[PDB]
Amino acid sequence: IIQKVFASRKELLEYDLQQREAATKSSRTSVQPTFTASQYRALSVLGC
Amino acid sequence: SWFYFLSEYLMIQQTPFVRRQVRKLLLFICGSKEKYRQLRDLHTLDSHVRGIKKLLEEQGIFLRASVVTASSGSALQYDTLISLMEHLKACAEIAAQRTINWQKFCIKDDSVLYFLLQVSFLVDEGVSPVLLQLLSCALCGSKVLAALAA
Amino acid sequence: LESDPCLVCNNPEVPFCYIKLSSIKVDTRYTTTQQVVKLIGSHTISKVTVKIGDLKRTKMVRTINLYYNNRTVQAIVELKNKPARWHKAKKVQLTPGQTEVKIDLPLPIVASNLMIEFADFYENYQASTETLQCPRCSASVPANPGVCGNCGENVYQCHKCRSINYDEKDPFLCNACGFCKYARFDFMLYAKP
Amino acid sequence: RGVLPYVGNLITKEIARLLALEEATLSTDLQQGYALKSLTGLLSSFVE
Numbered sequence: 001i002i003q004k005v006f007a008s009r010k011e012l013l014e015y016d017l018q019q020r021e022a023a024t025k026s027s028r029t030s031v032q033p034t035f036t037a038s039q040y041r042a043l044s045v046l047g048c
Numbered sequence: 049s050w051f052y053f054l055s056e057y058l059m060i061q062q063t064p065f066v067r068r069q070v071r072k073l074l075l076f077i078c079g080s081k082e083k084y085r086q087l088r089d090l091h092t093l094d095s096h097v098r099g100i101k102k103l104l105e106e107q108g109i110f111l112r113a114s115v116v117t118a119s120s121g122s123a124l125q126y127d128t129l130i131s132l133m134e135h136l137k138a139c140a141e142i143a144a145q146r147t148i149n150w151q152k153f154c155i156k157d158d159s160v161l162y163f164l165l166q167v168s169f170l171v172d173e174g175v176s177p178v179l180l181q182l183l184s185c186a187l188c189g190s191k192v193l194a195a196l197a198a
Numbered sequence: 199l200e201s202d203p204c205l206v207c208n209n210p211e212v213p214f215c216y217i218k219l220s221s222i223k224v225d226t227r228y229t230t231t232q233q234v235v236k237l238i239g240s241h242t243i244s245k246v247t248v249k250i251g252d253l254k255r256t257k258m259v260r261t262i263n264l265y266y267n268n269r270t271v272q273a274i275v276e277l278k279n280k281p282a283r284w285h286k287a288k289k290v291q292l293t294p295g296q297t298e299v300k301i302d303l304p305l306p307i308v309a310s311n312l313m314i315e316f317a318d319f320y321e322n323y324q325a326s327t328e329t330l331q332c333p334r335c336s337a338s339v340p341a342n343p344g345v346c347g348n349c350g351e352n353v354y355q356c357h358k359c360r361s362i363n364y365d366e367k368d369p370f371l372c373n374a375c376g377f378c379k380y381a382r383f384d385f386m387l388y389a390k391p
Numbered sequence: 392r393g394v395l396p397y398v399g400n401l402i403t404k405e406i407a408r409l410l411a412l413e414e415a416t417l418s419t420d421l422q423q424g425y426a427l428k429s430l431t432g433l434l435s436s437f438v439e
């Protein structure tokens with residue numbers, strides 16, 4: 001049950017991140033914040 | 049120009065007749081067999097690396113000077129990973145067969161190994177083995193891998 | 199006897215195993231040239247080995263198409279819809295006379311429902327279509343009306359479930375039970391839960 | 392004797408800890424929120 005819950009949490013978080021990114025990229029004044037290779041792994045669901 | 053455009057033609061799919069004739073004239077023109085094999089290897093690997101870089105270009109992964117930067121925190125999709133994997137599998141096959149040519153490439157183009165190391169942090173766990181295999185072929189060596197396989 | 203389950207210790211390294219498709223099978227549907235399968239749950243498939251037995255020279259598959267998706271459904275007919283809800287995995291072409299094929303997936307796929315299509319057929323048109331062997335008494339019957347003169351039974355009816363495919367007179371697979379005369383197909387999976 | 396500010400401060404502190412944990416990691420805890428539930432119930436008991 002814990003593994004199932006973890007998978008569900010991961011996918012819900014990834015969808016929320018994608019929706020937030022899509023909402024942010026619509027704005028023009030706000031520039032996209034660049035992340036280095038390590039910062040991506042820190043931010044993404046890779047290190048979870 | 050002859051070797052360039054000739055090797056460029058060899059990778060284009062056609063009937064076996066022209067491929068056989070063009071291979072024969074390749075092994076004629078390029079001095080000796082080691083030379084034509086080396087030229088094909090280097091050209092193929094350069095094309096594969098350009099393909100990988102363009103594929104990562106499409107999704108916001110940019111190698112500016114020597115650092116790989118990403119704009120999106122969202123992971124990549126299955127099609128992107130499969131297109132990465134085809135190129136990487138070709139490179140891994142040739143690097144595991146004739147490692148000297150792969151090493152010579154990595155010497156000539158200095159922004160390949162570090163690019164692979166940086167990109168290994170962004171791709172999922174299913175593509176790490178081939179990237180690590182390329183890194184080991186470049187740095188660890190060929191005879192060492194052969195001894196380890198024993 | 200631990201309060202907080204430790205992800206390191208609850209997650210060991212499970213290796214891949216060879217599982218037959220029918221063992222994970224829950225529900226199936228068959229059409230003239232396509233097959234839809236649902237498994238008991240999700241699986242990480244790596245290789246698919248397919249065996250052909252009792253094949254016929256009249257017709258066999260030249261190109262095999264594999265599709266997958268990870269959406270759980272209760273009815274196969276709901277997911278039978280072709281375009282919207284599938285992801286292509288690999289296209290394999292077969293030399294004539296092949297009995298075993300090794301569909302090797304470069305990336306393991308996490309799938310719950312699977313789809314197998316016979317995209318192209320290597321066909322032998324030398325077979326007589328005007329006159330057909332009766333499925334019941336092996337009597338030669340003309341194509342029209344397809345009713346045997348030796349026993350009064352139809353020809354387009356399935357040899358297994360006795361269902362007549364009025365739409366396609368000669369389907370590769372039966373539309374009711376899925377019986378196939380041209381060949382018999384068995385599937386293997388290099389997968390893990 | 393001044394126990395209401397004490398309980399309120401405890402509730403605020405544990406809520407802040409919960410938010411800080413939520414921002415960073417994704418681990419599960421089957422006993423999460425028990426202390427906050429107890430403190431809120433105690434405050435309601437004092438308040439009714």
Ligand SMILES: [Zn+2]
Binds near residue numbers: 346350351
């Ligand atoms: Zn008959």
Ligand SMILES: [Zn+2]
Binds near residue numbers: 356359376
């Ligand atoms: Zn039938």
